[PDB]
Amino acid sequence: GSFVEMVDNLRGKSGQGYYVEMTVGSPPQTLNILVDTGSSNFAVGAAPHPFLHRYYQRQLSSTYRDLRKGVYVPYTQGKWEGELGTDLVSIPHGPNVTVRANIAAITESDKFFINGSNWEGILGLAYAEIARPDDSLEPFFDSLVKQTHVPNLFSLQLCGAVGGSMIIGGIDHSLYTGSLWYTPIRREWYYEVIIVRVEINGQDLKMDCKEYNYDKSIVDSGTTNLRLPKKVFEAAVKSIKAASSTEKFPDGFWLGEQLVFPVISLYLMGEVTNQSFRITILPQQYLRPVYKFAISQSSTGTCMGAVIMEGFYVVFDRARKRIGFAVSACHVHDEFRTAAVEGPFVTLDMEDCGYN
Ligand SMILES: O=C(CCCS)NC1CCN(Cc2ccccc2)CC1
């Protein structure tokens, strides 16, 4: 339908994440919370860290309940650590409901909070299997669905340079143009998808598609870049470099070691046997103003981060185990080329593209 009061409920800074306003405890304690489809923990600052505008003060909340258990969460760059419990959570600019969700009260963290950022926590919207310490700690959205009449679905419109919309429990049709195209969620842990073909400026990379999903391919609102696996990255860069011989750039720039074009198509597995669709991004999407090359190599797989997500309206249709892509109404298009979602295409042996 409409969900007009949820539109434009996300803020941020370039490369610094997208956040929704949330309240915790009774009376409500307001916190800005990073929106992360690449993790499954709801975690907030609960101690006066210098970088924080505010923090969760448990002693002030009557509805707080201690779970008397600790949680240690190391990311690649840095870690956070906290004390588990539950409390009443709301999303002011979301649905009118209040849920008892697990909260990780961050007592200690290293390289997690950003000096100068305006957020105080993280909302992991992915599934239980990747929730820390283990799959028994129910992720926020799972509690929201179990406790209220909010449908098991949420959508994201991230708008490049910073704002956007998280539509909880539905789809706002104003936020996209044309048809939605759905790819199946491979397994419910990350939001894992299968990439079946990659074109740089409408030319196939001719690679084994099993390479494009090396380990995994996921939709990650918490990652800034498009993260391509090493083997795919090298072939992609060489091809992007080939199109861009009009200009000159240092060797380290493509490696993400310096600062300062072809469209990039990702063919994704469709709902139907031998059927695919493709999503297409403009240079506006992978050239991030600080300009930086917002495509980087990875060992964990393809991460369809903010670079990808900023061109498209993205439906996390958890109910139907699928993810929807449509042209975002807010993506950065010029007069020449426009970001696209196109289909159907004929693609055989798509099932073989998923690494095991
Ligand atoms: O581990 C993964 C998926 C690996 C394939 S790329 N995603 C994490 C999930 C946690 N998220 C937290 C975070 C987000 C923004 C700023 C700081 C930290 C960082 C990205």
Side-chain angles (χ1 to χ4, degrees), residues 34 36 38-39 75 112 122 190 216 218 220 222-223 300 303:
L34 204 101
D36 189 12
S39 57
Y75 304 129
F112 177 67
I122 183 170
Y190 297 93
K216 65 183 172 293
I218 70 155
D220 202 337
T223 305
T300 39
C303 304

Side-chain angles (χ1 to χ4, degrees), residues 36 38-43 69-76 78-80 82 84 102-104 122 124 127-139 190 300:
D36 189 12
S39 57
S40 302
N41 275 95
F42 183 44
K69 197 147 284 184
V71 63
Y72 186 85
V73 179
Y75 304 129
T76 319
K79 87 222 175 204
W80 61 264
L84 292 168
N102 302 310
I103 304 165
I122 183 170
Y127 301 96
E129 202 213 279
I130 56 159
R132 282 131 182 158
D134 51 69
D135 69 55
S136 74
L137 193 77
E138 184 173 66
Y190 297 93
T300 39

